[PDB]
Amino acid sequence: SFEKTPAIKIVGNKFFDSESGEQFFIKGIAYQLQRSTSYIDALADPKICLRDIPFLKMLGVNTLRVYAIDPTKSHDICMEALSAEGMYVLLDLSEPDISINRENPSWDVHIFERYKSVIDAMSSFPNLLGYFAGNEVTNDHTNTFASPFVKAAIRDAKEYISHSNHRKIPVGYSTNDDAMTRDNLARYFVCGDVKADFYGINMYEWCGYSTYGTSGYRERTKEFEGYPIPVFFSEFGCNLVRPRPFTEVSALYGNKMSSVWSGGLAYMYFEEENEYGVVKINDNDGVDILPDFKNLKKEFAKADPKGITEEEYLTSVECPHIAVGVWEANEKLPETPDRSKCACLDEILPCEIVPGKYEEYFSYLCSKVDCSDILANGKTGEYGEFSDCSVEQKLSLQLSKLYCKIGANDRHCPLNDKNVYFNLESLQPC
Ligand SMILES: OC[C@H]1O[C@@H](O[C@@H]2[C@@H](O)[C@H](O[C@@H]3[C@@H](O)[C@H](n4cc(CCC[n+]5cccc6ccccc65)nn4)O[C@H](CO)[C@H]3O)O[C@H](CO)[C@H]2O)[C@H](O)[C@@H](O)[C@@H]1O
């Protein structure tokens, strides 16, 4: 049974419970373990999730943000246990080792396959609230050209979900709070022909015993009035002053903010020595409640957002202009990564490379052949024909071009490295 968690849907700039029609406000907490797979999936481990859910119930949350799941594992036990306490999940599609790289952005078959795997693993659950297609990818004025890759990812995740048999779980974005870029980012993700379904801000402006006016919350709220998609704090909980009073929660669910924002999620459940936890897991794997816990609990308990209903509510935007060093996200987006096309390279290329060396060998190979066909430029909106293939496929293409330009036809690939091999399938006459 998922009785206690009806699916949430979006109408205009609000979330609604699909059965009752009541507006849905997120009262959440970030729930993610990390090592000190590379990531840890607490929702794949019943002994972990079933330990913590009673503590999450005490806090009074209705939503978790989860940053990374292992899509090869079952999540039925934990998702049903969450559902039984009225709890929903916001889930990032990426993981630290398979994310859009803000320093060298790409939207390719490897990242898209990750996104699809997560979608296929998690979309059966009615309490899956939504997916994030990225988290703080662009984070300042030096990497705004990453954002077209994120928008392509939003488009392609939505299309994959649309073409699947799954419920149409919304796909949004989570952004940081950099003064120079925030307004342009907010506009960019709702501009043109591809839009985020919702928009989370990682919002740390309220520290200690601040106020609506002095924190910045009043000006954030004014700039987001009339924003066309649901907006919430995908993270909050500045820890400058401890124990965190979480008095921002009273402002967030109050009358000035509840008509604009769809709530938010505290960062975070586990204490992991960034001093952001509300509990701490001891050496015996037991839960020790920290002094922040009771303040978050008290504030969420008091919070009573006056929303609207779906029926009464029911009665393109220009992309920011390009300016060098300020905003360099082209409106033109990279193409949908094509697994078949890129898989053809594995079949037909004479010289292949199995997955420091990428830098050296792209630099070597791209001095000898023209690598434009694998370059992707989010500033200029120029995306090479094979720029959507995996890093190894791209490198293999360039190696093979060099092999064909030499024209020896002797099965000797022109790069001495153990990962290089002649592909015998290339001989069988994409
Ligand atoms: O796509 C952009 C980048 O993505 C990186 O991986 C991401 C990871 O870095 C990211 O990690 C997640 C991390 O972002 C998040 N987190 C939240 C915080 C508190 C930040 C506080 N803070 C931030 C900024 C300004 C502040 C100002 C004042 C006060 C506080 C401020 N620190 N970390 O905590 C999660 C919990 O564990 C991580 O899982 O998770 C995403 C979801 O899986 C991954 O995509 C990739 O590794 C990187 O290559 C890529 O460039």
The protein residue whose alpha carbon is closest to atom 2 in ligand 1 is 137
Ligand 1 centroid – CA 241 distance (Å) = 21
CA-to-CA separations, 402 to 367, 407, 415, in angstroms, rounded: 10, 9, 9
Q: Please write down the long-range contacts of 153-156, taking CB distance under 8 Å and 24 or more positions apart.
A: 153/93, 153/100, 153/107, 153/111, 153/112, 153/115, 154/189, 154/194, 154/195, 154/196, 154/197, 155/194, 155/333, 155/336, 156/107, 156/112, 156/115, 156/336, 156/337
Phi, psi of 49 (to 5 degrees): -65, -40
Tokens of 421: 């091999």
Q: Are 285 and 48 in contact (CB under 8 A)?
A: no
- If we measure between CA atoms, which residue out of 6, 27, 24 comes closest to residue 125? 6
64: left (phi over 0), alpha (psi -120 to 50) or beta: beta
In single-letter form, the type of residue at position 70 comes to: D
Is the torsion defined by CA of 288, 292, 298, 301 positive or negative? negative
Tokens of 247: 């008095």
Tokens of 50: 């079933």
Ligand 1 centroid – CA 209 distance (Å) = 25
Residues in the chain: 430
Longest pairwise C-alpha distance within the chain: 77
Give kind and range of the element (H or E) at residue 134: strand 128-135
CA distance 327 to 141: 7
Would you say the CB of residue 267 lies under 6 angstroms from ligand 1? yes
Would you say the CB of residue 240 lies under 6 angstroms from ligand 1? no
Would you say the CB of residue 203 lies under 6 angstroms from ligand 1? no
136: left (phi over 0), alpha (psi -120 to 50) or beta: left
Tokens of 193: 């022909």
Q: How far apart are the first and last CA of the chain?
A: 47
DSSP-based three-state secondary structure for 251: helix
Q: Are 295 and 244 in contact (CB under 8 A)?
A: yes
Binding residues for (1,3-beta-D-glucosyl)n: 67, 94-102, 135-136, 177, 182, 267
CA distance 360 to 363: 5
Q: Are 118 and 298 in contact (CB under 8 A)?
A: no
The protein residue whose alpha carbon is closest to atom 8 in ligand 1 is 96
Q: Which atom of ligand 1 is nearest to the CA of 276?
A: 19
Active site residue 136: yes
The protein residue whose alpha carbon is closest to atom 19 in ligand 1 is 267
Q: What is the DSSP letter of 286?
A: -
- If we measure between CA atoms, which residue out of 135, 155, 70, 171 comes closest to residue 331? 155
Rg of the chain taking only CA atoms, in angstroms: 24
Give, for ligand 1, the residue of 202, 238, 241 to mutate: max count of ligand atoms closer than 8 Å to Cβ: 202
Ligand 1 centroid – CA 316 distance (Å) = 31
- If we measure between CA atoms, which residue out of 317, 320, 335 comes closest to residue 381? 335
CA distance 257 to 217: 8
Residue 257: cis peptide before it, omega within 30 degrees of 0 = no
| CA dihedral angle for residue 277, residue 281, residue 282, residue 283, rounded to 10 degrees | -130
263: left (phi over 0), alpha (psi -120 to 50) or beta: left
- Sequence-ordered alpha helix ranges (H) in 303-377: 310-313, 339-348, 357-368
The protein residue whose alpha carbon is closest to atom 43 in ligand 1 is 95
- If we measure between CA atoms, which residue out of 196, 177, 180, 200 comes closest to residue 188? 196
β-partners of residue 29 are: 64, 266
CA distance 172 to 189: 9
Task: Given the residues 235, 248, 299, 352, select the one marked as catalytic.
Answer: 235
Residue 170: cis peptide before it, omega within 30 degrees of 0 = no
Strands (E), 339-428: 351-353, 376-377, 382-383, 420-422
CA distance 222 to 200: 16
- Sequence-ordered alpha helix ranges (H) in 73-216: 76-84, 109-122, 147-163, 182-188, 212-215
Tokens of 155: 């488009």
Ligand 1 centroid – CA 137 distance (Å) = 9
CA-to-CA separations, 2 to 53, 86, 233, in angstroms, rounded: 16, 9, 26
- If we measure between CA atoms, which residue out of 139, 198, 174, 173 comes closest to residue 329? 139
Ligand 1 centroid – CA 135 distance (Å) = 7
Give, for ligand 1, the residue of 31, 43, 94, 265 to mutate: max count of ligand atoms closer than 8 Å to Cβ: 94
CA-to-CA separations, 102 to 136, 146, 251, in angstroms, rounded: 9, 6, 33
- If we measure between CA atoms, which residue out of 379, 400, 397, 380 comes closest to residue 388? 397
- Given the DSSP bridges, would you call strands 39-40 and 33-34 parallel, antiparallel or unpaired? antiparallel
Phi, psi of 234 (to 5 degrees): -70, -20
CA distance 402 to 368: 7
The protein residue whose alpha carbon is closest to atom 38 in ligand 1 is 67
Q: Are 327 and 184 in contact (CB under 8 A)?
A: yes
Would you say the CB of residue 146 lies under 6 angstroms from ligand 1? no
Q: Which CATH number fits domain 8-315: 3.30.70.1150, 3.20.20.80, 3.30.70.20, 3.40.50.800?
A: 3.20.20.80
CA distance 179 to 398: 41
Residues 6+ apart with CB under 8 A from 310: 11, 16, 21, 22, 23
| CA dihedral angle for residue 400, residue 404, residue 406, residue 412, rounded to 10 degrees | 60
Q: What is the DSSP letter of 331?
A: S
In single-letter form, the type of residue at position 342 comes to: C
Would you say the CB of residue 96 lies under 6 angstroms from ligand 1? yes
- Chain centre distance of CA 422: 38
The protein residue whose alpha carbon is closest to atom 34 in ligand 1 is 67
Phi, psi of 81 (to 5 degrees): -65, -40
- If we measure between CA atoms, which residue out of 378, 387, 318, 381 comes closest to residue 143? 378
Would you say the CB of residue 100 lies under 6 angstroms from ligand 1? yes
CA distance 67 to 366: 36
Q: Which residue has the tokens 């002649």?
A: 422
Q: What is the DSSP letter of 292?
A: H
DSSP-based three-state secondary structure for 200: strand
Give kind and range of the element (H or E) at residue 140: none
Method of elucidation: X-ray
CA distance 246 to 248: 5
Phi, psi of 55 (to 5 degrees): -70, -40
CA distance 87 to 239: 25
Q: List the domain boundaries for the chain.
A: 8-315
- Chain centre distance of CA 62: 20
Query: Residue 8: how many CA atoms within 13 Å on its side-chain side?
Result: 29
Give, for ligand 1, the residue of 32, 39, 41, 67 to mutate: max count of ligand atoms closer than 8 Å to Cβ: 67
CA distance 89 to 79: 8
Active site residue 235: yes
CA distance 402 to 385: 18
Task: Given the residues 113, 136, 248, 392, select the one marked as catalytic.
Answer: 136
Tokens of 124: 């059966």
CA distance 97 to 155: 22
Phi, psi of 421 (to 5 degrees): -150, 150
- If we measure between CA atoms, which residue out of 135, 300, 274, 245 comes closest to residue 201? 135
Would you say the CB of residue 291 lies under 6 angstroms from ligand 1? no
Give kind and range of the element (H or E) at residue 265: strand 263-266
